[PDB]
């Protein structure tokens, strides 16, 4: 067969590889039939037949029809039913389908082959009500999709019926009413077309075939191929398959199931069956489905076939399946099959079980768990979330995934108090500012009134993998009365509240939180992931606790420890930085600097203790100094600064003005500051090495790395590196001990990428700051472009927000260029990236292909990065 290919259980003319000719659906049907699946018989008319059709002036090419007839006879012989025969009726389904997804194609046409006589022959076992209802629908469907008759013309007839009979829910019409409606519908053909409904089944088929071919040249189909650049294709195929029913007595039925539990992964058929009826019934309230056992009970012969079909599906497709099947008088029929959707929990278990069952190897199992699946297992989740549907009192934005349960509080201070007592608090505030960070961190969940997916609470919460429901308009926080009205409900300080950051749901009361996992499957799965990936995955952390959390998540070290964050850790430390900034003499400045030394030395010791055995990369002071000044009205900033440092009103104002900048992103900061005030870098370097030594003397293994930020020339880097090495030697001489360490730089200035070869002579490693690199490369001030990014995305100007998904064409090109030039100068140059791009799958895949050595992201994104670093190689 060259233009028409039939198929059936264990028989098919085409095979799974003919996506071009048979089309995706046609090729898959051949595949399904070829492996022994109980698929109803049918045939496919090649895409080549469509092309010949279009060229011949949209006319049916010579010989084709002869083949189509050849194919149906085979189907008729296979089924033991003939087209247009009331005693042994054969109804057909006609579907389109090209090689790739394609809109504007003819919609599916069911029950083709009906007429007055066949309709009565169908009412025989399936009943009059259904037979004539199907006939009414078919006349409409076939009439509109094949004969191009407006739907309104038919509904125009049906409405009058119930408008006179007295109903609106068609499920109320009778067999005779439908018979009468069949008569009215046929008049529509005569009125609109000028000729009667084609009662000859073969005429229907022919018109259906031509309609599908014609569908290829539909407006939407053409637009898509020109508004989504495509070519070659050559046309669409037509899939004709025999119809089957489950309403032909108590020996028939329809059902749906997953070859495995989509929620837990348990290896057991999960679904439901409906005896003597079809899917429609349920939707109306006409019928209520049972569980699969009813099928094993009433139809053991068909059930056994269902099990063999399921094992064959998993055995051949190597994947859990979601299927739709029908049992027609003890005979099982496999209709639609597709990879089953599932929870992360289910995804990991199924992947591991299939490896243990010897169905697939690790390399393939890795592709069975999507980043989205793995992320569900990284945050807390509710046991039975369905049981709280009535307790839900509001829905806000799902700013940050995960379930949280705790007592409501209204200040960062109170969330901190709760945390200090080892208790769970839900911080509820109008919106958050950098002043609530401590409390936001202390709470188990955050709920705000204003702000969207990019508000302060959402962003910060996502960075910690902490549950957060944002922009929940239906809430009013009464700071003064210690209460919050949520959806008219009043919650007072101390009462329990639940939050689902994945849905944005605000649940009243304390819902159960799913107990921790004991399976061991995630551990097994992740071991295969770690075996396959070449990229190392590090974490960005600034405190001992985050370092520990990163390690428990599998981080191989810390790629970015931000020293400025360490000073923002407490009011006392911030005040200390301010004292240094306001110091009126060099003696008090050094005195203030010395205080910064213990803080730093102390924090690194704890960080080094937590990362015992792993490299820890510390970045020097990054922000401009004004970021350490209090915020608010100039009057209050001055008042506060004088009270905290001793400066008088005059010098306080002068200094604030001197530290003010027009574009703080690109001013007096980073190495520019460490170069102009070398004592700053000497202080931090001193703290790093003394902490490193002190821990090494306690048996801790320390691999310190110092990163110089915002370098644009090799001279800036060489200056800081020289300073760092001089301090290293002094400290090692004073302590009488020496340890290894590396000095490197953050590559975030476009110029640094351009002169990367020279910068590599001074740097032992490259740490890409793609966030800032993107800012400078796009000339985008992330804090301010939010005002037009949405417009750019909606108008097709941007495909993705460059700050979330690495811009491979632009920013990525500078990343590749810098990596190549740096490595030519220093062959063993370690190159990596630190930032959210280091935790975003498509970006991680790019970094892997670009040849980087590692990525570094937030502690809870680490497992996601690991997963993505493996999948790109598989």
Element (H, E) at 33: helix 23-34
Say whether 770 counts as a known binding-site residue: yes
Q: Which stretch binds a copy of itself (CB under 8 A): 357-365, 775-783, 832-840, 842-850?
A: 775-783
Q: Choose from a copy of itself, Mg ion, none: what does 229 bind? Cβ within 5-8 Å by kind.
A: none
447: closest CA among 494, 410, 479? 410
Query: What is the C-alpha separation between 874 and 869, in angstroms, rounded?
Result: 10
Q: Is 436 in the site for Mg ion (CB under 5 A)?
A: no
Q: Which stretch binds a copy of itself (CB under 8 A): 426-434, 455-463, 561-569, 772-780?
A: 772-780
Residues 6+ apart with CB under 8 A from 519: 349
Q: Is 779 in the site for a copy of itself (CB under 8 A)?
A: yes
CB of 717 to a copy of itself, least distance (A): 10
Element (H, E) at 745: strand 742-747
841: closest CA among 380, 366, 364, 320? 366
Q: Which residue in 417, 810, 842, 851 binds a copy of itself (CB under 8 A)?
A: 810
Give the helix ranges, DSSP H, for 568-633: 571-582, 586-610
Q: Are 342 and 48 in contact (CB under 8 A)?
A: no
Q: Choose from Mg ion, a copy of itself, none: what does 792 bind? Cβ within 5-8 Å by kind.
A: a copy of itself
Query: What is the C-alpha separation between 850 and 869, in angstroms, rounded?
Result: 12
Q: Which residue in 700, 754, 805, 873 binds a copy of itself (CB under 8 A)?
A: 754
109: which strand partners? 94
For a copy of itself, the binding residues in 672-691 under the rule CB under 8 A are 672-673, 675-676
Q: Is 431 in the site for a copy of itself (CB under 8 A)?
A: no
CB closer to a copy of itself, 389 vs 787: 787
Q: Which two tokens stand for residue 280?
A: 């429609």
Q: Is 794 in the site for a copy of itself (CB under 8 A)?
A: no
Q: Is 664 in the site for a copy of itself (CB under 8 A)?
A: yes
Query: What is the C-alpha separation between 344 and 362, in angstroms, rounded?
Result: 17
Identified catalytic residue from 337, 472, 671, 834: 834
CB closer to a copy of itself, 389 vs 809: 809
Element (H, E) at 326: strand 321-328
For Mg ion, the binding residues in 735-774 under the rule CB under 5 A are 748, 769, 772
Q: Which two tokens stand for residue 824?
A: 């030519």
Say whether 619 counts as a known binding-site residue: yes
Q: Is 713 in the site for a copy of itself (CB under 8 A)?
A: yes
Q: Which stretch binds a copy of itself (CB under 8 A): 5-13, 267-275, 697-705, 746-754?
A: 746-754
Say whether 771 counts as a known binding-site residue: yes
Q: Is 776 in the site for a copy of itself (CB under 8 A)?
A: yes
Query: What is the C-alpha separation between 659 and 681, in angstroms, rounded?
Result: 19
Q: Determine the size of the site formed for Mg ion (CB under 5 A).
A: 3
CB of 438 to a copy of itself, least distance (A): 23
Q: Is 795 in the site for a copy of itself (CB under 8 A)?
A: yes
Q: Choose from Mg ion, a copy of itself, none: what does 492 bind? Cβ within 5-8 Å by kind.
A: none
CB of 748 to a copy of itself, least distance (A): 7
Q: Are 11 and 52 in contact (CB under 8 A)?
A: no
Q: Choose from Mg ion, a copy of itself, none: what does 657 bind? Cβ within 5-8 Å by kind.
A: none
The DSSP bridge pattern shows strands 397-400 and 467-470 to be antiparallel
CB closer to Mg ion, 416 vs 748: 748
Residues 6+ apart with CB under 8 A from 535: 844, 847, 848, 852, 853, 854, 855, 865, 869
CB of 459 to Mg ion, least distance (A): 17
Q: Which stretch binds a copy of itself (CB under 8 A): 308-316, 442-450, 737-745, 751-759?
A: 751-759
Q: Choose from Mg ion, a copy of itself, none: what does 769 bind? Cβ within 5-8 Å by kind.
A: Mg ion
Give the helix ranges, DSSP H, for 646-769: 649-659, 671-676, 678-696, 714-735, 750-754, 756-759
Give the helix ranges, DSSP H, for 611-713: 634-645, 649-659, 671-676, 678-696
834: annotated active-site residue? yes
The DSSP bridge pattern shows strands 558-562 and 854-857 to be unpaired
Q: Is 836 in the site for Mg ion (CB under 5 A)?
A: no
Q: Is 814 in the site for a copy of itself (CB under 8 A)?
A: yes
Q: Which stretch binds a copy of itself (CB under 8 A): 218-226, 563-571, 592-600, 668-676?
A: 668-676
160: annotated active-site residue? no
Q: Which two tokens stand for residue 638?
A: 């001055």
Query: What is the C-alpha separation between 497 and 321, in angstroms, rounded?
Result: 38
Extended beta strands in 73-149, E state: 92-95, 109-112
Q: Which residue in 78, 224, 496, 668 binds a copy of itself (CB under 8 A)?
A: 668
Q: Which two tokens stand for residue 242?
A: 């025999």
Query: What is the C-alpha separation between 621 and 594, in angstroms, rounded?
Result: 15
Query: What is the C-alpha separation between 280 and 850, in angstroms, rounded?
Result: 52
Indicate the annotated binding residues for substrate.
562, 619, 748, 769-772
Catalytic residue numbers, as ranges: 456, 834
Residue ranges binding Mg ion (CB under 5 A): 748, 769, 772
Residue ranges binding a copy of itself (CB under 8 A): 658, 661-668, 672-673, 675-676, 710, 712-713, 715-716, 719, 748-751, 754-755, 772, 775-781, 783-785, 787-788, 791-792, 795-798, 807, 809-811, 813-814
């Amino acid at each position: 067969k060259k233009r028409v290919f039939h198929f059936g259980k264990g028989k098919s003319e085409g095979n799974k590889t003919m996506k071009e000719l048979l089309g995706g659906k046609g090729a898959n049907l051949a595949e399904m039939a070829s492996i022994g699946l109980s698929v109803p018989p049918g045939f496919t008319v090649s895409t080549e037949a469509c092309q010949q059709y279009q060229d011949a002036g949209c006319a049916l090419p010579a010989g084709l029809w002869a083949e189509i007839v050849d194919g149906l006879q085979w189907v008729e012989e296979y089924m033991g039913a003939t087209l247009g025969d009331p005693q042994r009726p054969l109804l057909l389904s006609v579907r389109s389908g090209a090689a790739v997804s394609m809109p504007g194609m003819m919609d599916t046409v069911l029950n083709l082959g009906l007429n007055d006589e066949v309709a009565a022959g169908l009412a025989a076992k399936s009943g009059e009500r259904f037979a004539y209802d199907s006939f009414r629908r078919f006349l409409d469907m076939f009439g509109n999709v094949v004969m191009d008759i407006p739907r309104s013309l038919f509904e125009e007839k049906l409405e009058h019926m119930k408008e006179s009979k007295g109903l609106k829910n068609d499920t109320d019409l009778t067999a005779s009413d439908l018979k009468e409606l069949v008569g009215q519908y046929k008049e529509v053909y005569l009125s609109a077309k000028g000729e009667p409904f084609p009662s000859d089944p073969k005429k229907q088929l022919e018109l259906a075939v031509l309609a599908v071919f014609n569908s290829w040249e539909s407006p939407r189909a053409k637009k898509y191929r020109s508004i989504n650049q495509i070519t070659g294709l050559r046309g669409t195929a037509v899939n004709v398959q025999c119809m089957v029913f489950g309403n032909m007595g108590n020996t028939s039925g329809t059902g749906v199931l997953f070859t495995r539990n989509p929620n837990t992964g348990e290896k057991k058929l999960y679904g439901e069956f409906l005896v003597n009826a079809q899917g429609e019934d349920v939707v109306a309230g006409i019928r209520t489905p049972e569980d699969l056992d009813a099928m094993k009970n009433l139809m053991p012969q068909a059930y056994d076939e269902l099990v063999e079909n399921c094992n064959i599906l998993e055995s051949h497709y190597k994947e859990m399946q979601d299927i739709e099947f029908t049992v027609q008088e003890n005979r099982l029929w496999m209709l639609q099959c597709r990879t089953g959707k599932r929870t992360g929990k289910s995804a990991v278990k199924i992947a591991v079980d299939m490896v243990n069952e010897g169905l697939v190897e690790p390399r393939s199992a890795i592709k069975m768990v999507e980043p989205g699946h793995l992320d569900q297992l990284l945050h807390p989740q509710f046991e039975n979330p369905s049981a709280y549907k009535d307790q839900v009192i509001a829905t806000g934005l799902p700013a940050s995934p995960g379930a949280a349960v705790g007592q409501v509080v209204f200040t960062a201070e109170d969330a901190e108090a709760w945390h200090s007592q080892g208790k769970a608090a839900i911080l509820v505030r109008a919106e958050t500012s950098p002043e609530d960070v401590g409390g936001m961190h202390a709470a188990v969940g955050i709920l705000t009134e204003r702000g969207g997916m990019t508000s302060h609470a959402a962003v910060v919460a996502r960075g910690w993998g902490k549950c957060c429901v944002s922009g929940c308009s239906g809430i009013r926080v009464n700071d003064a009365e210690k209460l919050v009205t949520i959806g008219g409900h009043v919650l007072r300080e101390g009462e329990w509240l639940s939050l689902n950051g994945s849905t944005g749901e605000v649940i009243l009361g304390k819902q159960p939180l799913s107990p921790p996992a004991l399976s061991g499957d995630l551990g097994t799965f992740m071991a295969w992931v770690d075996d396959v990936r070449k990229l190392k995955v590090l974490a960005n952390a600034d405190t001992p606790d985050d370092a520990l959390t990163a390690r428990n998540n599998g981080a191989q070290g810390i790629g970015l420890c931000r020293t400025e964050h360490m000073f923002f850790a407490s009011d006392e430390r911030i005040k200390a930085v301010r004292q240094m900034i306001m110091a009126p003499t060099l003696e008090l400045r050094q005195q203030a600097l010395d205080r910064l030394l213990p803080y730093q030395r102390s924090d690194f010791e704890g960080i080094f203790r937590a990362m015992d055995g792993l490299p820890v990369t510390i970045r020097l002071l990054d922000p401009p100094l004004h970021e350490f000044l209090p915020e608010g009205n100039i009057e209050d900033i001055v008042s506060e600064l004088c009270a905290e440092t001793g400066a008088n009103q005059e010098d306080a104002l002068a200094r604030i003005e001197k530290l003010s900048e027009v574009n703080p992103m690109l001013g007096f900061r980073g190495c520019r500051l460490g170069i102009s005030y070398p004592e700053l870098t000497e202080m931090q370097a001193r703290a790093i090495f003394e902490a490193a030594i002190a821990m090494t003397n306690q048996g801790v293994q320390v691999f310190p790395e110092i990163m110089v930020p915002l370098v644009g020339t090799p001279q800036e880097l060489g200056h800081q590196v020289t300073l760092i090495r001089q301090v290293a030697e002094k400290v090692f001489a004073n302590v009488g001990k020496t340890i290894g360490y590396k000095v490197g730089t953050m590559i975030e200035i476009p110029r640094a990428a351009l002169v990367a070869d020279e910068i590599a002579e001074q740097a032992e490693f490259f740490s890409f700051g793609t966030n800032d690199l993107t800012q400078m490369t796009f000339g985008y001030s992330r804090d301010d472009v939010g005002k037009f990014i949405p417009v750019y995305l909606a108008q097709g100007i941007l495909q993705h927000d460059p700050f979330e998904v690495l811009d491979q064409r632009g920013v990525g090109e500078l990343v590749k260029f810098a990596t190549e030039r740096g490595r030519k100068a220093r062959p063993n140059l370690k190159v990596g990236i630190c930032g959210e791009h280091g935790g975003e799958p498509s970006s991680v895949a790019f970094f892997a292909k670009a040849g980087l050595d590692y990525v570094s992201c937030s502690p809870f994104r680490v497992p996601i990065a690991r997963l993505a670093a493996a999948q790109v190689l598989v």
